[model samples]
Target: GLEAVRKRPGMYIGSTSGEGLHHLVWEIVDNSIDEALAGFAKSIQVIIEPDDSITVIDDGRGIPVGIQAKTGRPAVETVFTVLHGVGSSVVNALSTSLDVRVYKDGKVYYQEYRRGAVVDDLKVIEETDRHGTTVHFIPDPEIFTETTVYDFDKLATRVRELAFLNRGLHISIEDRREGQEDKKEYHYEGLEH
Candidate 1:
């Protein structure tokens, strides 16, 4: 399992740079967005706080909390621990730490893992009327040696293009790092930017 990161960490993460560090955040967000694309998610929020920790919240069907048939492990565990075991490794970035919250079919379930190990088993955190998922993660400094400092303007420009390409989808970026106050929201409903 550890070999997955050692053998081809870059393939999973892209490059060992600050961009790759941020890519981990995007991968998790993209997973949530995939749910949205499938008509199960609505809103997705990405928060880069002062501590450089990233949090992504999506109002969509959370990841399946049931046990995986093949691995005999919880689905969330499989998601973080096994590289190339999830899907679309070429598309998704590697994750160092991840916490997923799922609100499914009138029930709430939560799972937290670090580098693919099930540190916290799936537990029902709430019984709510809402349905969706939220994920919070911190990039691994060991894997990403380039930098921890995030670039808001660079991210905004890229997300804006994505919003323009995906019609009817809303994407927002918020940066709360010290000394910087930047917030951007983008949406395209088959219209010109």
Candidate 2:
């Protein structure tokens, strides 16, 4: 499983370079997009901050928060700690930093995972009437042997393709490092790209 990915990372990632690093980001984003397709999210924001950290926010139903039958821990924690845990096994490296905030049924559940392990248990941080998830994380440079620099235009084009593919869904990428004002609105009416 994960050991196979580590041993033959190239077979899965196609390269042992920065492109594979970016692919990891896209894979996670695709998962979010899948949620959008299932009518869970309406707006998705991908922000590349100055510190090489990535933040993804969605205005839809957050990832489910339940107890894992195998580990007897919060499912969110299990998703981070266990290799091949939640969605796919092609990429099994532990996340350097992971934060998942689940707002559902008028309450907010907050959990943070660091270095591929759960740093804290799921706790009710506050009461929220809205429902969604905000995940902010920085990939571990130790595991990623290349640079973490990301190209904004490349990500923007991919996001455009996603919006086109999804039709009415709104997907936006903001590069705040260059002093560019965040583009907050996306219109998919009467235009095709």
Quote each prediction's TM-score: 0.84, 0.82
**lDDT minimum window of 10 residues, candidate 2:** 85-94
What TM-score does candidate 1 reach? Answer: 0.84
User: Candidate 1 on 135-155: residue-level lDDT in tens?
Assistant: 777666666667877788877
Task: Give the poorly placed runs of model 1, Cα more than 4 Å off.
Answer: 85-96, 190-193
Candidate 2 lDDT: 0.71
Query: Cα RMSD to native, each candidate?
Result: 3.2, 3.4
Each model's lDDT comes to 0.69, 0.71
Best by lDDT: 2
